[PDB]
């Protein structure tokens, strides 16, 4: 039900813990602060719409960069906290916290820029991007600024060292307690790998088994992007493994890019396992069991990110993949609750 689903989604942002997690993510929050500041020349003395303003922090960054008027639109009850944060910082004459969905807000003017932090796990979980695109079409002046301006999706095959340790735990029990439990390994593999949920977990370079590849890109100014979201975002990929390891599946992550403005140097916010950890971690797609691979084993496939039929805000990923000389396989995943 939409009244329930959307209402409950916005109510999840009315609690402190999610905002604590987002604002405690210094990689994310500083990237926005600096990406906004990089665009001082387009923002100073100009007007901004903040889509999904939360506690108001990004709208405040825009005012500190010199924006004349910021419309901070927030559909959850957290807008009331944003109103107090804005006043606490001496900004209520310029930054206007507006309750409700951006889809129905009525601003007194089109704006020079939109800022929004709309990205969920696996980039598109929560399905907020459509709201930003709706706001761009309705409210952004021609040639106006979008912050960030684009997103890119990346994949790499992985050998998850933590998963390997959890599966190997059962073969270690005998040395610790004198009871052989090595026969539990197949059961543990079915439980931890055989399900069909997208798993949000932090990896490192030690887990990455081949050079990461971009498999899709989302340029927010593009008119056709809304319908691509409905049909599925993604693409084919092909890589060659660095070395021998048990292949456990794939990690999907994203980056977003802020235009460089006067500096002519764009700022990239990345969620790669090769870069500092963020609250988004990575989105892990486990195969049903490990598959041994070696140096120069080719792995290919196709990944599609779709809204789930049951809940339009729940990310589904359809994976098709081929490891080496093995048969083509498929697996259909949905975001873990």
């Amino acid at each position: 039900t939409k009244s329930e689903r959307d209402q409950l989604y916005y109510e999840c942002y009315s609690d402190v813990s999610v905002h604590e997690e987002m604002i405690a993510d210094q990689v994310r929050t500083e990237a926005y602060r600096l990406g906004i500041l990089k665009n001082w020349a387009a923002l100073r003395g100009k007007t901004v719409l903040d889509v999904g303003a939360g506690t108001g922090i990004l709208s405040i960054f825009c005012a500190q960069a010199g924006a004349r008027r910021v419309y901070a639109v927030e559909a959850s009850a957290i807008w009331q906290q944003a109103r107090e944060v804005v006043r606490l910082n001496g900004l209520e004459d310029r930054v206007h916290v507006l309750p409700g969905p951006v889809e129905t807000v009525e601003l007194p003017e089109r704006v020079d820029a939109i800022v929004s932090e709309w990205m969920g796990y696996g980039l598109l979980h929560e399905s907020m991007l459509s709201s930003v695109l709706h706001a761009r079409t309705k409210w952004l002046k021609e040639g106006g600024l979008l912050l960030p301006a684009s997103a890119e999706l990346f994949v790499a095959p992985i050998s998850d060292q933590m998963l390997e340790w959890r599966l190997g735990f059962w073969s270690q029990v005998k040395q610790h307690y004198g009871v052989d439990m090595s026969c539990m390994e197949s059961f543990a593999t079915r439980c931890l790998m055989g399900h069909s949920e997208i798993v949000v977990q932090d990896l490192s370079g030690e887990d990455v088994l081949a050079r990461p590849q971009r498999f899709a890109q989302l340029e927010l100014a593009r008119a056709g992007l809304e319908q691509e979201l409905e049909a599925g975002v993604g693409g084919r990929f092909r890589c060659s493994c660095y070395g021998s390891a048990p292949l456990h599946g794939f990690a999907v992550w994203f980056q977003v890019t802020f235009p460089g403005g006067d500096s002519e140097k764009p700022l990239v916010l990345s969620t790669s396992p090769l870069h500092p950890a963020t609250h988004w971690k990575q989105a892990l797609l486990y195969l049903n069991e490990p598959v041994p691979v070696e140096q120069d084993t080719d792995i290919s496939g196709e990944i599609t990110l779709l809204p789930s039929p049951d809940n339009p805000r729940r990310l589904r990923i359809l994976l098709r993949y081929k490891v080496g000389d093995h048969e083509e396989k498929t697996k259909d995943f949905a975001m873990e609750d």
Binding site: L8, E11, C12, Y13, E21, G120, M128, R313
Partner: peptide, 6 residues
């Protein structure tokens, strides 16, 4: 852990 789980 719980962003957008609503």
């Amino acid at each position: 852990s719980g962003x957008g789980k609503g």
